[PDB]
Amino acid sequence: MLKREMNIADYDAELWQAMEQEKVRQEEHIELIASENYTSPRVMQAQGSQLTNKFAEGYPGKRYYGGCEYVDIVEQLAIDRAKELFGADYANVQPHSGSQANFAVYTALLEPGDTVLGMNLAHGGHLTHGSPVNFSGKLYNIVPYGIDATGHIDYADLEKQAKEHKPKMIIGGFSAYSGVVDWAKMREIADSIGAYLFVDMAHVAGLVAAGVYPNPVPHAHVVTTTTHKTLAGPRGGLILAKGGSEELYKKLNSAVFPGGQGGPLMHVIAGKAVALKEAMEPEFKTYQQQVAKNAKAMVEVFLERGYKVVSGGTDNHLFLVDLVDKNLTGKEADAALGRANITVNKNSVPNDPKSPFVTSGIRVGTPAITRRGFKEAEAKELAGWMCDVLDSINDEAVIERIKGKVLDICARYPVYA
Amino acid sequence: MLKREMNIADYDAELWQAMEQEKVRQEEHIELIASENYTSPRVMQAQGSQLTNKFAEGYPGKRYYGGCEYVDIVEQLAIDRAKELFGADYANVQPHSGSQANFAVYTALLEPGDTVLGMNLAHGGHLTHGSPVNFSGKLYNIVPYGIDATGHIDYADLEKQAKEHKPKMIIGGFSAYSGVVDWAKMREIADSIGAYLFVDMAHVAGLVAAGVYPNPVPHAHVVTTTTHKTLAGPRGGLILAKGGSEELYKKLNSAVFPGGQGGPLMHVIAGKAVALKEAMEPEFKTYQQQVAKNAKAMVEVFLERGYKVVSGGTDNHLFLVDLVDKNLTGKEADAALGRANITVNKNSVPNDPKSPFVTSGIRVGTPAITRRGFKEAEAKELAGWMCDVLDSINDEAVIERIKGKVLDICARYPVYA
Ligand SMILES: *Cc1c(COP(=O)(O)O)cnc(C)c1O
Ligand SMILES: *Cc1c(COP(=O)(O)O)cnc(C)c1O
């Protein structure tokens, strides 16, 4: 039946039409939506490989069915590289998503109905970290802890509510506009209660990978991350652990399979193995340093133009722009910048007068533009254009003026050259 | 950074080595492991597309973030084709796996701790259908129902245990060696108790797609399936429903997102849309008829050679070979046929004297060989070779004799020509 050509575009016309229109969009839009990144052509071509036909159920070396003698090596490379890169003695590259990566931890260490002191969803919290609409909040009792006025973690507030409710696990996952997390302090608090320390570094994986952001793995029980964000990866999940007992490692192993999922996607795992090797390169370090370098350069521009930035400056690669004083909503800023081909997302400010859906502020990330080839001089130029739109918010002529400059710089700096 | 070449093999040597060794294996091994199939090059090339960079969270037409104007069309094509093909007015192509596809149904319609009358795991039952090691059995109370001696469903036994325990949902998923399921009878039983009717046709999706196997969708509440088995698809899940209320459709919609998973894999969904179009072709029908035609031809050979086949003959594309009378174990039959490059899996027989891990029998499927180009004359030849190995089970010369013939027929009939 299979003649080994069937080009995606001689059979299905309308699907290819929509496929290439998205390709044009990505080549003509500035992506400043937080922690979104472009992946390697090595990953793409490994993801679209013949390994999608292979059904391997279980773990390498101890599979159920025969003929898994070669795919065990493919997965082991992804495991061994994950261990060496983040300095862990445990790695799991089978979870389909970051939501599934977290799901395993809850089913392994927690009973249905246990008190979990997770980060507040209303103030930058993740869905899998405790949400009424998510499985995490429905099955488990969630008691939220809040951050301080600037955005940094109140360590005295975390020590409280710990004796009041006595949680079995505390979630110290990274959220928006928050600075560095003292994970050494997290362990001291968790040990006094007798609770598990769970840290989700999904958002800041690439920065820890190069050595720009502190590593939570050395002093945490279970650490989860996405392989497709600040690490430039296939879309998936990862479970890492350091300094634990083998009886606790097999808890997480059983939590993935046969916990919540069946056979892992080997074509994605092949893309995971190559992506980790690219992160080990010295060229990945210079890129990741330039990500934080561009983030700082942008904050300088917004402050000089009279726009308030949360926490004064940026710690990593994310910064939130306050628009309360300018009397503008984040929904109106999103649509205005969206028309000028600048992709930003609306975000709620601390002490927001307006609806959490109207947001009165915007969130800007820098990993997508740095991957393209934007330097400090290009990052300040783009930040200058954004302020031009925010000044004349309803002037249509100004929006078209910026878009033309955006279309030019996208033509000068392509994603895939 | 990205120079738009980075061939998978000039950077990572050992990964490509393992990748091509699996490609050689698949081209030199006869796959008779049940319901495993080779996918289209259209799917592979759409799975390894630039759509992996796109982050679209939510549902088409009502996304959270801007710039999702084109990916809504990509997903809608996968939805519209899924509806028309299986005759449903509801489709969901976002679930990452069949385990996640089932997970949504349980979280949407059932409370944690509800009595569920699912199929017996010990006798052909699926893991997500009620298993002590799986999330389905841990969160929900599972009461198992068993099949009759031949393998067909005891309808009187299903009517019992329904008043004894009063379940809120009954699972009528397809299992091994079972014939046709009277799904019209399933509805009559479920309505009397006031329970949801959940049918998993994952294993027999392609046969229903062509019109060889009866369709459970017209008379069932919720129907789930994998898009990567007897349908020749990207590895994923699908939720279908027909004749329900909109308040029950939005239960399943919320069950996927923000139920158990975040943003869907758009590169896989693009592969899902093209795979459904290929199933609509008249050439897919003639293939699927030839799948059942080869299954019947093989049973004829095994019966003439004095080997017992469960249920007398095959109903669809799966048949189980009994080896109790021959005094051979399914573990020894697996290893012997495995060395002759025949990939079969060990399976337990009804009333098994030996361990469920030693299995005293084997399970053979026919969708992989039919996809390659095997007809009735080629299917009977292969079945003849299998019996030659089972007759002289410890004779090493015979095993090498068959392998040579297997290597020849694989060279004559390639997967991707
Ligand atoms: C079919 C199947 C699944 C579905 O996902 P796979 O990719 O096929 O693993 C899950 N578990 C079992 C036991 C299956 O047979
Ligand atoms: C990061 C993220 C996830 C992880 O999976 P995606 O593919 O990025 O969707 C899940 N939910 C939310 C809200 C996320 O930000």
Curated annotation (Swiss-Prot), chains A, B:
Result for mutant: P258G: Important decrease in affinity and catalytic efficiency
Domain of life: Bacteria
Record keywords, A-Z: Acetylation, Amino-acid biosynthesis, Cytoplasm, One-carbon metabolism, Pyridoxal phosphate, Transferase
Binding site for glycine: S35, Y65, R363
Catalytic activity, reaction form: (6R)-5,10-methylene-5,6,7,8-tetrahydrofolate + glycine + H2O = (6S)-5,6,7,8-tetrahydrofolate + L-serine; L-allo-threonine = acetaldehyde + glycine; (6R)-5,10-methenyltetrahydrofolate + H2O = (6S)-5-formyl-5,6,7,8-tetrahydrofolate + H(+)
Phenotype upon changing R363K: Exhibits only 0.03% of the catalytic activity of the wild-type and a 15-fold reduction in affinity for glycine and serine
Cofactor(s) listed: pyridoxal 5'-phosphate
GO molecular function, one term: zinc ion binding
Result of changing P264A: Important decrease in affinity and catalytic efficiency
EC code(s) of this entry: 2.1.2.1
GO cellular component: cytoplasm; cytosol; membrane
Residues the entry annotates as binding pyridoxal 5'-phosphate: F55, S99, S175, H203, H228, R235, G263
Effect after changing P218G: No significant difference in catalytic efficiency and affinity compared to the wild-type
Residues the record marks as site: Transaldimination and stability: F55, R235
Stated consequence of mutating R372A: No significant difference compared to the wild-type
Residues modified to N6-succinyllysine: K62, K242, K250, K277, K293, K331, K346, K354
Result for mutant: P258A: Important decrease in affinity and catalytic efficiency. Reduced thermal stability
Site (Plays an important role in substrate specificity): H228
Result of altering P214G: No significant difference in catalytic efficiency and affinity compared to the wild-type
GO biological process: glycine biosynthetic process from serine; glycine catabolic process; L-serine biosynthetic process; L-serine catabolic process; tetrahydrofolate interconversion; tetrahydrofolate metabolic process
Entry function: Catalyzes the reversible interconversion of serine and glycine with tetrahydrofolate (THF) serving as the one-carbon carrier. This reaction serves as the major source of one-carbon groups required for the biosynthesis of purines, thymidylate, methionine, and other important biomolecules. Also exhibits THF-independent aldolase activity toward beta-hydroxyamino acids, producing glycine and aldehydes, via a retro-aldol mechanism. Thus, is able to catalyze the cleavage of allothreonine and 3-phenylserine.
PANTHER family named among the record's database cross-references: SERINE HYDROXYMETHYLTRANSFERASE
The protein's name: Serine hydroxymethyltransferase
Organism: Escherichia coli (strain K12)
